[PDB]
Amino acid sequence: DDWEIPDGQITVGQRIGSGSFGTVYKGKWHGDVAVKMLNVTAPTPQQLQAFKNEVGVLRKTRHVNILLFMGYSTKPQLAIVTQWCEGSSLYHHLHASETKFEMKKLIDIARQTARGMDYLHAKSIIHRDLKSNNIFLHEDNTVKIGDFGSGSILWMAPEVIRMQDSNPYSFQSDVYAFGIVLYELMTGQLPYSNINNRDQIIEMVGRGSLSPDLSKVRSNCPKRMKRLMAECLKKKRDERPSFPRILAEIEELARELS
Numbered sequence: 001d002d003w004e005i006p007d008g009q010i011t012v013g014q015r016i017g018s019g020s021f022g023t024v025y026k027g028k029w030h031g032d033v034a035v036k037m038l039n040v041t042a043p044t045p046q047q048l049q050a051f052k053n054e055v056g057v058l059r060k061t062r063h064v065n066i067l068l069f070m071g072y073s074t075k076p077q078l079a080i081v082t083q084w085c086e087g088s089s090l091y092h093h094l095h096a097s098e099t100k101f102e103m104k105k106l107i108d109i110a111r112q113t114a115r116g117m118d119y120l121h122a123k124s125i126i127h128r129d130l131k132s133n134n135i136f137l138h139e140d141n142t143v144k145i146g147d148f149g150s151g152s153i154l155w156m157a158p159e160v161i162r163m164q165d166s167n168p169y170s171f172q173s174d175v176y177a178f179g180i181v182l183y184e185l186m187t188g189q190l191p192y193s194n195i196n197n198r199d200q201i202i203e204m205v206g207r208g209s210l211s212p213d214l215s216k217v218r219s220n221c222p223k224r225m226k227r228l229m230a231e232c233l234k235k236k237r238d239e240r241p242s243f244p245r246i247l248a249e250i251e252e253l254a255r256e257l258s
């Protein structure tokens with residue numbers, strides 16, 4: 001009904017990391033949790049509404065691939081509480097571990113990711129900033145999608161880079177985001193890897209003249225999964241697939257099997 005954790009109950013220990021959002025610690029509260037304490041000292045009364053309006057959105061997410069919102073503090077600092085996750089994120093795995101993932105295991109991670117996303121949309125939540133860094137792999141099996149509610153241009157649809165008019169952030173923008181995750185998964189690689197220049201990419205992808213190189217997909221990706229990708233990466237936004245049918249193709253190609 002109300003989800004506030006009164007001062008005292010969370011035992012904050014260890015500083016894991018941060019962001020423009022906030023700073024994230026591990027912690028004890030009826031078991032393990034994570035606490036993202038916002039960059040804010042004195043809560044201005046209109047700021048206690050910014051938060052509780054952002055919280056009312058967070059508590060409309062129940063689902064196994066949507067990070068588990070659990071509670072919000074007020075009294076030591078504005079903060080969001082959630083499940084503690086185990087292991088490391090999709091990014092860490094696809095880049096600075098060198099973990100071989102089999103085609104089987106990679107498709108599943110894509111399946112579980114678009115499971116998160118279709119749910120959020122069914123709920124009318126534009127994520128806005130999906131990427132492999134904000135997909136935490138709990139136990140190295142279960143996708144948990146978080147950090148919803150410059151920054152990272154690599155997952156940014158051309159219309160976002162540039163800017164539509166009345167939108168541009170929308171269900172579709174979330175969809176190009178999802179393709180770039182597909183590229184990462186199905187090439188094990190960040191795109192524009194050879195062209196390492198933020199300005200170049202911002203200017204060249206928004207103008208419609210640089211798009212991911214699909215020849216770097218591992219020779220053993222299915223051709224269903226490869227065509228699915230290039231649909232999502234469409235520069236024209238409304239030619240893009242929306243999420244029901246994205247979640248169809250993936251589960252429905254997943255058989256095959258091993």
Ligand SMILES: CCCS(=O)(=O)Nc1ccc(F)c(C(=O)c2c[nH]c3ncc(Cl)cc23)c1F
Pocket residue numbers: 016024025034035036058061066067068069080081082083084085086136146147148149
């Ligand atoms: C349910 C959506 C809440 S969120 O959008 O604000 N995302 C969010 C909120 C609070 C958090 F602490 C975190 C977060 O980064 C982690 C949540 N669980 C984790 N487990 C391990 C690590 Cl390393 C980080 C986290 C996080 F991703």
